[PDB]
């Protein structure tokens, strides 16, 4: 654990960090622009 | 130090004695209801029926 670490995150360490953060932000955007559209799609799928 | 405890003990005992007397007074009253009022428009409204619809809760 990293309670006793010099940096709370120490983000550099993880495995190349690039694909992980890219997917993270893209999935954040997908959840932000998928549900609002999906609500309208479902409402038209209804009556 | 303890005089305050004694004094509030005394007045709380007085309070509960008076309250018990007043409870004896209030009870033993028959409480006969008067006649139902005429059905004014603003009484007994049902905008959306209750889940336990026909009569309100506590009846």
């Amino acid at each position: 654990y990293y309670i006793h670490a010099k940096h709370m995150y120490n983000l550099d360490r993880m495995k190349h960090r690039g694909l992980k953060m890219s997917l993270a932000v893209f999935s954040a955007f997908s959840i932000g622009v998928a549900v609002p559209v999906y609500a309208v799609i479902f409402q038209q799928k209804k009556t | 130090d303890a005089y305050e405890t004694a004094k509030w003990e005394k007045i709380t005992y007085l309070g509960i004695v008076s309250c018990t007397g007043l409870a004896i007074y209030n009870l033993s009253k028959g409480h006969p209801h008067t006649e139902e009022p005429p059905a004014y428009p603003y009484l007994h409204i049902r905008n959306k029926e209750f889940p336990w619809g026909p009569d309100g809760l506590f009846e």
Binding site: - | T12, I16, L22, H33, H44
Partner: protein, 265 residues
């Protein structure tokens, strides 16, 4: 130890009770809607969420008691901070009941043309404001005096009579809630009546709910004082209980005066 931590504030350790309580609140809210509108899973979901909130609250207070009584993490400063937080909570509740009182007053100063321009509406048999409501005020007044007696029991080093005063107060609060229940059952008018009945019952019901929660707070403090968890110098739970009960009594006094005295006049 403090000499290595270099500051007397409190540093808590992780506990899933925040997230669990939030999940319980979501359960309670969806169950509330599904019971408000007729649905299959309504009642069971609402009850399950409500007991979930109760359980998480129980384990949360148990954890706080465990820390502060056995681990001893409460120092003077966090002791003060707890008082600060609870005074703020009481202020919030004051504003809530202020909003309800505003609803009543805005509905009862200038009654509309559609209830005759008069108050109370014709055909609503107002309670005599002196048979039951006066007894309820006397009961809560004696309960407040008993709470003060309990506080001066704890402070004066006499840590045995504190349980006697607390149990007397709990008995008075139970008598009060019983008489409020009797008043509800013997009511000559229901909630679905005019604005008078509606605001009366909403305000009185929330006041009674606050009475229930204050009473159970007092029961918890009574059990703690019987078990010895409180001392003359270091006791915040009892002080919170006393302040909350004084709050409930003051709200009842305003409620009695305005609604029962003025509204019936």
């Amino acid at each position: 130890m403090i000499e290595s931590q270099r500051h007397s504030y409190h540093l808590v350790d992780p506990s899933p009770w925040p997230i669990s309580g939030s999940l319980g609140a979501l359960a309670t809210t969806v169950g509330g809607v599904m019971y408000m509108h007729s649905f299959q899973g309504g009642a069971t979901l609402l009850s399950l969420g409500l007991i979930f909130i109760l359980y998480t609250m129980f384990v949360w207070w148990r954890d706080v008691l465990r820390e502060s009584t056995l681990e001893g993490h409460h120092t003077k400063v966090v002791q003060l901070g707890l008082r600060y937080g609870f005074i703020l909570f009481i202020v919030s509740e004051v504003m809530f009941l202020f909003a309800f009182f505003w609803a009543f007053f805005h509905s009862s100063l200038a009654p509309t043309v559609e209830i005759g321009g008069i108050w109370p509406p014709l055909g609503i048999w107002v309670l005599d404001p002196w048979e039951i409501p006066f007894l309820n005020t006397l009961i809560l007044l004696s309960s407040g005096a008993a709470v003060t007696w309990a506080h001066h029991a704890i402070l004066a080093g006499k840590e045995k009579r504190a349980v006697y005063a607390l149990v007397a107060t709990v008995l008075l609060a139970l008598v009060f809630t019983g008489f409020q229940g009797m008043e509800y059952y013997q009511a000559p008018f229901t909630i679905s009546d005019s604005i008078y009945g509606s605001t009366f019952f909403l305000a009185t019901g929330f006041h009674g709910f606050h009475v229930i929660i204050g009473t159970l707070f007092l029961i918890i403090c009574g059990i703690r004082q019987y078990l010895g968890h409180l001392t003359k110098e270091h006791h915040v739970g009892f002080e919170a209980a006393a302040w909350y009960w004084h709050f409930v009594d003051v709200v009842w006094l305003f409620l009695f005066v305005s609604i029962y005295w003025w509204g019936g006049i």
